[PDB]
Amino acid sequence: GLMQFTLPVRLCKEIELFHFDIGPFENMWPGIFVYMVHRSCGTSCFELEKLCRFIMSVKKNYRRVPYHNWKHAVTVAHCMYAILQNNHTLFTDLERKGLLIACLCHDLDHRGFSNSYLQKFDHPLAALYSTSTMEQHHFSQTVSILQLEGHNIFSTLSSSEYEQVLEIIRKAIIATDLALYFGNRKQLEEMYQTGSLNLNNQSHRDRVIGLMMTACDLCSVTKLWPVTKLTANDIYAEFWAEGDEMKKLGIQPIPMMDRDKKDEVPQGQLGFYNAVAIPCYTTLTQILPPTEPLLKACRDNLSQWEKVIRGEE
Numbered sequence: 001g002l003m004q005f006t007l008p009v010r011l012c013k014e015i016e017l018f019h020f021d022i023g024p025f026e027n028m029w030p031g032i033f034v035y036m037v038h039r040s041c042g043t044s045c046f047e048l049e050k051l052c053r054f055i056m057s058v059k060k061n062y063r064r065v066p067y068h069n070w071k072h073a074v075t076v077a078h079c080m081y082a083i084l085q086n087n088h089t090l091f092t093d094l095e096r097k098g099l100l101i102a103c104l105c106h107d108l109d110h111r112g113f114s115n116s117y118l119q120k121f122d123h124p125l126a127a128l129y130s131t132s133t134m135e136q137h138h139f140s141q142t143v144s145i146l147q148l149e150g151h152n153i154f155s156t157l158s159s160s161e162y163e164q165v166l167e168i169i170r171k172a173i174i175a176t177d178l179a180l181y182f183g184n185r186k187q188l189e190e191m192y193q194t195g196s197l198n199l200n201n202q203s204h205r206d207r208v209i210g211l212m213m214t215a216c217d218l219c220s221v222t223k224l225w226p227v228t229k230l231t232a233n234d235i236y237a238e239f240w241a242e243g244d245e246m247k248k249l250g251i252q253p254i255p256m257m258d259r260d261k262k263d264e265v266p267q268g269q270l271g272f273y274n275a276v277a278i279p280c281y282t283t284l285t286q287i288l289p290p291t292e293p294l295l296k297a298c299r300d301n302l303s304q305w306e307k308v309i310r311g312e313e
């Protein structure tokens with residue numbers, strides 16, 4: 001009832017900032033997330049015994065892969081917490097509840113392979129889900145864990161609020177398929193610029209929540225340079241393992257995934273900052289002005305990759 005979560009002073013202050021790193025102590029990630037739900041939503045959004053049991057079943061269903069792991073899940077939820085606290089009054093009680101859970105669950109049971117590799121391997125999940133393969137699997141696993149005895153954190157919601165929140169989570173999670181991002185942002189751009197963008201239109205909200213999810217998912221590019229640089233080793237370690245597996249199938253992987261082409265990482269990160277990250281955080285700042293720090297930090301790390309290419313580090 002009267003049981004707050006508190007953090008040490010440095011975390012209490014730094015958790016409010018977009019660039020916050022959740023640190024190397026795994027056993028504090030759960031308390032960090034609960035802290036965020038309580039400040040974002042209220043101490044009464046979720047029955048604490050159910051929330052805790054949900055958090056630990058979710059953790060157990062992330063795998064020990066280099067990048068798409070439990071640490072990524074809590075990183076992406078933290079970024080969503082930063083967005084929600086800097087845009088307090090633009091979001092319903094249900095959106096606040098659904099979106100933090102959506103981020104924690106958004107890569108459940110990820111095996112460290114692209115939708116592409118599932119399809120070329122002919123993995124069962126590719127027959128069951130022809131597009132957004134892993135992301136439909138991630139949502140599926142969220143519903144599984146919600147249905148476990150003592151895990152329904154949404155038990156108090158009305159029959160209809162329950163369906164609305166699971167629909168918020170489904171779209172939120174589908175949106176983390178980067179193939180769907182390019183379309184979603186082009187439309188969000190055109191709607192903002194012609195002035196058609198309207199946040200009372202539910203299909204316009206959907207698109208905005210979609211872009212928030214891509215922002216939160218990419219937030220490793222908005223960290224202090226040494227966090228951004230080291231995280232890149234993790235994500236390339238998956239990409240190269242996939243490359244190896246593509247070669248095992250008799251297929252030349254794209255350069256991104258070919259560990260023979262390590263040399264070209266800086267140029268590839270440049271490409272990705274220009275094609276993906278900068279556009280994302282640009283359009284997000286236009287739509288939601290207080291998210292500007294994500295854009296500014298992204299721009300800083302781009303400049304840090306330009307420096308790497310010029311032999312200046």
Ligand SMILES: CC(C)c1nnc2c(C(=O)NCCc3nc(-c4ccccc4)cn3C)cccn12
Binds near residue numbers: 232235266272
């Ligand atoms: C940490 C998080 C935020 C993160 N980082 N990257 C990503 C990507 C992604 O598409 N990355 C690859 C960028 C890239 N590399 C090459 C390359 C490299 C070496 C040799 C040759 C070509 C090419 N291109 C385009 C997707 C989702 C989250 N990501």
Ligand SMILES: [Mg+2]
Binds near residue numbers: 106107177
């Ligand atoms: Mg994913």
Ligand SMILES: [Zn+2]
Binds near residue numbers: 072076106107176217
């Ligand atoms: Zn992710």
